[PDB]
Design a protein around this ligand. Structure first.
Ligand code: HEM
Ligand code: HEM
Lengths: 137, 137
């Protein structure tokens, strides 16, 4: 289930982090306008960039702690507040988070792993709701 | 589901509040000691008393609002705080609340009306956790 999937991702975090984030950027290529130096590059050229692996692992490090601190896929309001008040997230609306979780769930449903993809969908939805309550447009 | 259940209960509140509360005291008779005006009265005698109908409805009115404000059966920390810091709940421990929800779920599973009883179980567990966090021994 959801709690298990957390441990699964954390067991091979950078690989899942890069692969899921690549799924997101390939599903929604105009999302790359929020990042610097990601455009014009294939999967293998994002992966030999130093910052891509590092930054993206940090993203999922935090995503897994937010998931881990959740109850029944409901994230802490304090975790949503952190995500909204991060300088690096100042350009975002909740719709950017919706796209990420749509791509995440799609990735899980296509993988050869026994993920609980319905829970990740509930979690993405609950996080969007929480981001709105914490004041993200 | 859980949301429909709130509407079912709200629709005929005086009746559900009294029925569930009595199912609580009858399953756990020791609990009556906390409601000193109800000691030594039959089910029918309690209904003739003004503060029984009126205080029990208010009990369940609050319960329904906590339920309505929950996400996926997870109540707000602020709502758990209110229940803890109520003059009337000063002598209580989380076990008192655990007993209420056991009786409530049992009542629901025995009824003719169709209830999402596993959700009310979940809600009870989550609320007990929130009460403990908020400082209830
Ligand atoms: C639950 C979802 C998310 C979590 C936990 C998360 C977490 C993070 C973390 C930890 C960083 C800092 C990384 C570092 O400094 O190395 C970061 C940076 C950033 N995030 Fe996210 N993030 C999430 C969703 C998103 C989404 C959906 C977008 C846009 C589509 C986004 C845009 C950015 C940008 C533009 C930066 C700074 C630039 C960069 O690191 O290259 N965030 N976020
Ligand atoms: C989530 C479940 C509960 C909710 C929403 C709740 C809510 C309330 C509210 C709003 C009152 C004030 C009623 C009034 O003065 O009209 C109250 C009174 C009281 N409650 Fe709680 N309660 C809950 C569970 C419990 C439990 C588990 C016990 C102990 C077993 C308890 C014991 C009392 C007592 C002894 C009073 C005073 C009696 C009265 O004022 O009529 N309640 N309850």
């Amino acid at each position: 289930g959801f709690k298990q999937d957390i441990a699964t991702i954390r067991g091979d975090l950078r690989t899942y982090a890069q692969d899921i984030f690549l799924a997101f950027l390939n599903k929604y290529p105009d999302e790359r306008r929020y990042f610097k130096n990601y455009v014009g590059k294939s999967d293998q050229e994002l992966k030999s960039m130093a910052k891509f692996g590092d930054h993206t692992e940090k993203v999922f490090n935090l995503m897994m702690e937010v998931a881990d601190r959740a109850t029944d896929c409901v994230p802490l309001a304090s975790d949503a507040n952190t995500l909204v008040q991060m300088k690096q997230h100042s350009s975002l609306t909740t719709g950017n988070f919706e796209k990420l979780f749509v791509a995440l769930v799609e990735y899980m449903r296509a993988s050869g792993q026994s993920f609980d993809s319905q829970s990740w969908d509930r979690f993405g939805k609950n996080l969007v709701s929480a981001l709105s309550s914490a004041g993200m447009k």
